[PDB]
Amino acid sequence: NPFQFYLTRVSGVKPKYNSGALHIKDILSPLFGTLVSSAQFNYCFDVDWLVKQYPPEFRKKPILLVHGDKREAKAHLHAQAKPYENISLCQAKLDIAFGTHHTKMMLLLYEEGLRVVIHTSNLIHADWHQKTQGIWLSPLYPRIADGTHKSGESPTHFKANLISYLTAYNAPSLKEWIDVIHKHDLSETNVYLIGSTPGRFQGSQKDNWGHFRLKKLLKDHASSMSWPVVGQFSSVGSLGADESKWLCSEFKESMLTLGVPLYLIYPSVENVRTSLEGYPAGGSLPYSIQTAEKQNWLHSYFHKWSAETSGRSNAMPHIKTYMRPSPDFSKIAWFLVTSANLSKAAWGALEKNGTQLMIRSYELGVLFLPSALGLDSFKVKQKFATFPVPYDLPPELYGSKDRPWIWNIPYVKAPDTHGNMWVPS
Numbered sequence: 001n002p003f004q005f006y007l008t009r010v011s012g013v014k015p016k017y018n019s020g021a022l023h024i025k026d027i028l029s030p031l032f033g034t035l036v037s038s039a040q041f042n043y044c045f046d047v048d049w050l051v052k053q054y055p056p057e058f059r060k061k062p063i064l065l066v067h068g069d070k071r072e073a074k075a076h077l078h079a080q081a082k083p084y085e086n087i088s089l090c091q092a093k094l095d096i097a098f099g100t101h102h103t104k105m106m107l108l109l110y111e112e113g114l115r116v117v118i119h120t121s122n123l124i125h126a127d128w129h130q131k132t133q134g135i136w137l138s139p140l141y142p143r144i145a146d147g148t149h150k151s152g153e154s155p156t157h158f159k160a161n162l163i164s165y166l167t168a169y170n171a172p173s174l175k176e177w178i179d180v181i182h183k184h185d186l187s188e189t190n191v192y193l194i195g196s197t198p199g200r201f202q203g204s205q206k207d208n209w210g211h212f213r214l215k216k217l218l219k220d221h222a223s224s225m226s227w228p229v230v231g232q233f234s235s236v237g238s239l240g241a242d243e244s245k246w247l248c249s250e251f252k253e254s255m256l257t258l259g260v261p262l263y264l265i266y267p268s269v270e271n272v273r274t275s276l277e278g279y280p281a282g283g284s285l286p287y288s289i290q291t292a293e294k295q296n297w298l299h300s301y302f303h304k305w306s307a308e309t310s311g312r313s314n315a316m317p318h319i320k321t322y323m324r325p326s327p328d329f330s331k332i333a334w335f336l337v338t339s340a341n342l343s344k345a346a347w348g349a350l351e352k353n354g355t356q357l358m359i360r361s362y363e364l365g366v367l368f369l370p371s372a373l374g375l376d377s378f379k380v381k382q383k384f385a386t387f388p389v390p391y392d393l394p395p396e397l398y399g400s401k402d403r404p405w406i407w408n409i410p411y412v413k414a415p416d417t418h419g420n421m422w423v424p425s
């Protein structure tokens with residue numbers, strides 16, 4: 001299995017749909033390595049829950065929480081963490097308004113080596129219970145021989161790219177992690193790192209982050225041959241008065257680069273209502289009416305969540321993925337799993353006559369390119385060489401009575417899976 005792409009365990013589906021799936025407890029298990037230290041990058045944290053996910057033998061090893069919380073939220077997290085002597089915090093600078101530290105990553109230092117986990121879940125119980133989430137698991141990276149001269153770099157430049165991603169935080173606790181990474185051999189890595197960090201980026205720096213980073217990698221490492229672009233996310237930013245301000249102009253331009261139909265997959269109200277969680281799934285799909293009403297044009301692109309292939313049509317998506325399938329959806333030019341939702345905040349927007357890329361947030365994903373395996377395309381695994389696309393293809397268009405889930409309006413005409421309504425207030 002060259003991909004090491006996994007879905008999270010979902011409670012309440014037939015065990016067969018969990019056979020290849022991982023829970024955070026599986027990831028932190030002693031079978032994965034003898035744990036020495038770890039760093040947990042994320043957005044939302046439940047500290048008490050998090051510590052319980054570690055096996056008892058490792059619960060006392062040092063843990064760094066890398067978050068972007070400010071003011072009261074920051075003190076609240078510090079409070080959550082106070083009781084546990086072994087936990088430190090690193091607040092990621094967020095100098096631009098409306099930015100978040102949204103990246104989900106685990107750095108796991110073991111006696112036997114190092115593991116990097118890049119994924120889509122918050123460190124709270126409900127993100128790992130009944131949601132469709134994605135995980136990339138790196139191989140066990142060995143420590144570089146105490147007396148040898150090697151970069152420990154991969155053909156994909158993962159080691160250096162990860163270091164540059166961490167370097168951008170300018171944070172003392174991350175420098176130690178940077179030092180740990182320097183000391184390991186990451187050469188077996190076959191994926192590309194695509195990061196976002198807060199900044200306004202000029203000249204050659206534009207290629208470093210966000211959608212320009214992706215455009216850059218697709219230009220250098222993909223080959224060109226009508227192939228659609230598929231985008232799949234759980235949050236939607238304000239994209240502009242029409243499709244030509246950002247979505248189809250700079251954003252799609254990056255995505256269609258190689259060496260045109262746009263499908264956007266986003267849960268409808270019906271998807272959420274009939275889900276395993278019901279309407280409360282909607283708490284993690286924060287599309288607000290203020291944003292939606294500004295951009296009714298967008299919803300023509302929306303397609304339903306459907307994941308029969310993985311038994312997860314009722315497990316609402318918190319994963320985010322982008323890909324480039326062939327016209328019959330049987331193969332793909334590339335696949336990306338990332339924390340980046342469909343927002344300018346996450347991906348970048350061009351400013352100052354198009355000489356500046358403005359990103360608001362930290363995001364991180366892994367791009368799977370066939371060339372990194374010495375292929376030209378991946379065949380799509382039709383039943384979750386062959387890439388495990390986690391939802392059904394082709395995607396299904398919203399019906400005429402369908403609506404995009406909007407989290408801050410009420411739904412009171414029809415009860416959900418648990419006989420409940422939704423009245424946010």
Ligand SMILES: NC[C@@H](O)c1ccc(O)cc1
Pocket residue numbers: 043044122234235283284285286
């Ligand atoms: N459910 C908490 C809410 O703040 C939220 C919603 C969506 C996310 O991706 C992360 C957090």
